[PDB]
Symmetry: D2
Amino acid sequence: TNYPLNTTPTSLNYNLPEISKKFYNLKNKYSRNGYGLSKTEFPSSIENCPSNEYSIMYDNKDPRFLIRFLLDDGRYIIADRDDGEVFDEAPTYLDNNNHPIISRHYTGEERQKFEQVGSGDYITGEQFFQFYTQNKTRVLSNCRALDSRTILLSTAKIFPIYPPASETQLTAFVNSSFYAAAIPQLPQTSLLENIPEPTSLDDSGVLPKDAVRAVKGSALLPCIIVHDPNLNNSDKMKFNTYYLLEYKEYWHQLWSQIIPAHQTVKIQERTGISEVVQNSMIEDLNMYIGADFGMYFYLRSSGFKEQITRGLNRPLSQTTTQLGERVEEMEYYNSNDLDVRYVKYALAREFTLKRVNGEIVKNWVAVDYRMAGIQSYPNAPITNPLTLT
Amino acid sequence: TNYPLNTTPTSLNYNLPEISKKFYNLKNKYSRNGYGLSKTEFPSSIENCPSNEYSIMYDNKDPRFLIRFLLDDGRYIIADRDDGEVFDEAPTYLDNNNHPIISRHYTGEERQKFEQVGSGDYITGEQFFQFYTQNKTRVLSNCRALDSRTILLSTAKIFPIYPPASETQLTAFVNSSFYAAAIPQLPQTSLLENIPEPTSLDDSGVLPKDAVRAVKGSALLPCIIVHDPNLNNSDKMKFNTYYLLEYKEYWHQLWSQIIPAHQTVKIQERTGISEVVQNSMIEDLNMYIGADFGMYFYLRSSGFKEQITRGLNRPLSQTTTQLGERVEEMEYYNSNDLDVRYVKYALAREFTLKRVNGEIVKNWVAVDYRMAGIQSYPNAPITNPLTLT
Amino acid sequence: TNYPLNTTPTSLNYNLPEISKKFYNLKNKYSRNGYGLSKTEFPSSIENCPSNEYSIMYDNKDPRFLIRFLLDDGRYIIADRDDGEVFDEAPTYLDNNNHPIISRHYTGEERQKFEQVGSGDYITGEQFFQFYTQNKTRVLSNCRALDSRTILLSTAKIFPIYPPASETQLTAFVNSSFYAAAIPQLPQTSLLENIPEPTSLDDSGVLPKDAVRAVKGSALLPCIIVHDPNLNNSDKMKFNTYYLLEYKEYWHQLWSQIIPAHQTVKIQERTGISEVVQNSMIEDLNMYIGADFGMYFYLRSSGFKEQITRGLNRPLSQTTTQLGERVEEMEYYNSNDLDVRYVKYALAREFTLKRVNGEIVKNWVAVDYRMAGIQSYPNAPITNPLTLT
Amino acid sequence: TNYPLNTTPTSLNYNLPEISKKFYNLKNKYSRNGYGLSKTEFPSSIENCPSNEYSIMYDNKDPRFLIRFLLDDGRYIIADRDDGEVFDEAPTYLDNNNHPIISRHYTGEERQKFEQVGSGDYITGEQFFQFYTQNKTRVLSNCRALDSRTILLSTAKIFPIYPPASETQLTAFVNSSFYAAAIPQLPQTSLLENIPEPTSLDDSGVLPKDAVRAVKGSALLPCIIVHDPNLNNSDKMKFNTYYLLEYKEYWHQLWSQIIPAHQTVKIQERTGISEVVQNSMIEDLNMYIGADFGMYFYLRSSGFKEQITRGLNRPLSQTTTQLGERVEEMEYYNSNDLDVRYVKYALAREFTLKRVNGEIVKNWVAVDYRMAGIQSYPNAPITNPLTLT
């Protein structure tokens, strides 16, 4: 036989473009003197092009290094290496009905999304790229100048590739020098064991802290969606440009007891997830587990929902209701004529956020009461099922 | 130093989902008796569910093996292993305002595009997927039955995950057995030499057949977009599920001559591309080179334009006009007082279609007259430039 | 620039042949009826070919699945999937000066090492392989038969490829069906931070449990060299065919204290490694840390020493003396006129043994007193160094 | 099912260490002023350390960039980037029974082989490596100096790691800056079709130029073993540091004819390989095909024989006799009562040498008459076999 006789693990994938894995210095393709996007504190040199501390500046010193995080629809969030803020088409107006591009914290709003279009010079054949907004009805452009300090804006004044128009020069970017993004290694998958079956009356089984996890999925989260206040902005973006979100399953013990012959016991079974754990996941990732056990995304992470759920191998939630905490008091009777070790597990769905360096930031676990079972020693067909109620 | 002192080649990427790389047997998740999509020649067993030879059938024998080719917008073309036809939402009506899904040759029309949505059972937690059309206003569904021979259709009768509705069962697919797609290996990139400079008066330089190609890009073309009449449907889909389209550049010699001291010569320079070569690329790939030297895609390949151009590293064309053939008669005068070997090259942009087995199906070359040069021995500053006109 | 402006992690490599990653059913190339190596409990069918419970049997039922672990010199240890024992050329004699091949626990002795040679049939061109011992002066061969139950032995009766000899048939193996080996994923490397410098007088710095590890190396250990009594033989070989040995470094705090102006303190500094930890590494891996901080290997792991040290990025030890434990009482005086927070770290060299499933079996740490430093707040040039003695 | 229902191609592997893939500047670990191995034309600054134009020099200018090609036994050939010559322990004597290390063309002799040993400073913990010859009875060492221009030699004066000896400093190398080796991409494997069967009486079948090759193996050949006089030394080493040797199989047509009912034909069948083709392979690669169809290696390539044959998937030859050319006149009779299209193929074993840029340098083909067949239309059981003789 050509393939193994046993199952083998799979590589988890989370493919990204090169521009989503590098912070590039973005230069103007036509500038004679090295001008490109900049984080200069000096003001605009040009009337009708005013700057302030929010402006995305254009200068031939103090360059920005910018990563393009890929959204599910192919647009990009353009994020800065040094302060972790993003470009944002501000709804205010400059002259001539243009909007300034500003630096702002990431919100996931439409105004922070940019479509990259690959184009070029019709005469020379040289390639460059541009950024558009509003379904290609606005283009990003320097304010007036190719070779003086100015600001970046978006304009609705767009020109066709032919006949070539001077103004298009102000929209033409090329990649220059770059820093690599820090990206976690994706773990390999692993198989989940069967729900653990006791081997003797003294086998108390496996506690959640000791249960072997099966790795089932993983996503690379842009750091702009992660709130990790243990780091500052610059360390997060430079050393943890993407965080790892692992999806793992394990059997989570509800309880384990010898139930003597003909005896009743009452046992609390706690499953689902607590509001405390759900509120933590909202705060850290803008995600929570829906009442259908799918993943629900608020606006900050929403733009990456399809990629993240594809990588985790868990579905998008179809309900806005949060999964709740189930706390149920269960009364069990062992009708057998022998003492029986009983143990109940439900499947835990564990999401773990990690830094590039492997540190665990947080885990959040949903105990899935729809996927549970009671195992025992001795067991069927020697004994009859434990009776509930 | 941590990185090499020389440049190194890069891997070309063309990432695809697993479902775009496998022909899967698609089974109904709830069927008790093994029913799924089928290529049975037997008719539908059910009134109000009529079948004919175009129907996509549902049966527990003669399964189809279906690949999902990924479109630029995340939708899929669903294509059959055995006959290379695709699923198509026919505009005709069954009862209850539903449309039949039929098998049809690939056109690239909207009616052949399907959105896959990952869902699951709200009670059991078991996962499955569905197919929607028309911006999630129709879902694909068996006609009436889970466990008898019937047809596949699309319906606008969709139900929410909660409360669970019986009818949703008819829409629920899972992957089963599969065959791997045949996929070409992507070549590694290589650097283009400088435009060749003669080393002596007898150096006649390099003819196009002998010029070293630099590999600059590559795309994997679904075979549904390739017309390769040397193969039948079944061989193309099973052994060449994707073709390779390489993008390579080389210097293409226009002419090489010793032009004696103080002598004039007249030389025809042929550049651009011929209509014959453009018509061939249209026929084989539904693509041509635009007058801006970008890539232009007709409807058959249009759905994959962004992925293909990203892989080739050539831009999308912004003009519908075809690149033409330039045939120019040039008159040159060597004003130097010595005999000078002159050679003129322009950059050739070569697209080569290959089978999985490495066979070359076709090459098409656009000679780019915007990127050309005349080199010589002896040369500047010893001689003055050749004068044109 | 063509390469990043920052350092990037590297993949750790630990390349192995395919036969070292699969347990293959080894069949005789010439047998007409499916005979190959077997774990049959039935006895040899042949006089002068006696079997007992140690014999490696040859039969057409109950096949063995055998992995070939690659030794530093290119020889192989041939190990069984089901019981984890290895083939061994027993020094006892059968008739005709031959030795029986037996199953035995792994020792790493010369008698358990086999040279695989790729050969073939001179007439037909068909390929097969053989196993030799004693620098190709003995070949492994069935005892007498191609197509009856017998034993495996080694013989000094070897024949040249030409003219073809009948007896060579008994030596000719081919690979058949197989199970994949379970192999851990190799971690990516990471950079070690500078020795931590306090930022205030109240910064007590980082305890060993909390120190970030830099991954610097890793080796895949054949499970035959690992003593992991938490598993039985069959689970170890099938689910942990190779263990992972990670090499990581971190800064290990000896102490942290404010030493007030003009005050003396006495502090115990514990470095090196304890005999208890060294004896554990000997028991589990047959390795210890030499007094030169290199790796020392006893016979069980010795055969893989070069591969293991190449993967860990630590050198082979040149001394048989074990690294000892240094327990030193240090007297420090702060001569500065201000209270100074002082902290001392030495570099820890941490070796961690993991299962395929990621569970940590053990860690062993050597605290390297040759690579240590005292940092402080405030620090040079504001203060003078802490004086020792 | 978990694996495909069809066969899938495999990656060919040819794993190499990092030092075999980079030309490193080798510096002395203890030098205060940047000294290391050098290609300086200036003479040795030191009495008793004479230099000439063959010496491997040691200086702090004009560094060498040296690749270490890995031999089957783990030793290295140390080769220069700029002239493609190798280090060689010359049998002449300096003072004190030492030998000079010289630069020499590659021969594959024992005097050009070096064992790299990873060591370090016993006091500081800093790592470095050394080079030994003659089974670790000589070490490479600077002649006398750490920080003046001198020569490289080998000495039998070796000191233990403990107690540390001054002289060991002269043997201690570290890697510095580097250039990446140019290395070909390894092709993916492909399956060989069945021997082609005609489909009609007019099907004349497939000529060798048109036969589809199955890729079955590949090796990366150090350029020191390849004679490629189309390039100079510097271009070969910098741009083709390794050549690719592909192993491919195809069906090579001996003849195709309609043999009419009851008619005889006489046909020349040419198989094996010509002396002309064997002499070419000897000249270019120092290899030929043995009479057993295995690979035979002369001294220049012998050191890499195991790696090369493992990569090609062809065995080492067990005979010194060259495969010859078989030229046989065959008389065939068609005893059937109908006209039959007959075609005879034998399996061709094709070895193709390629540059990094993909150019084909040469092919050599052995037509294997042991693996041949006559196919026909019509065929068995409709017709009787063609009778030979």
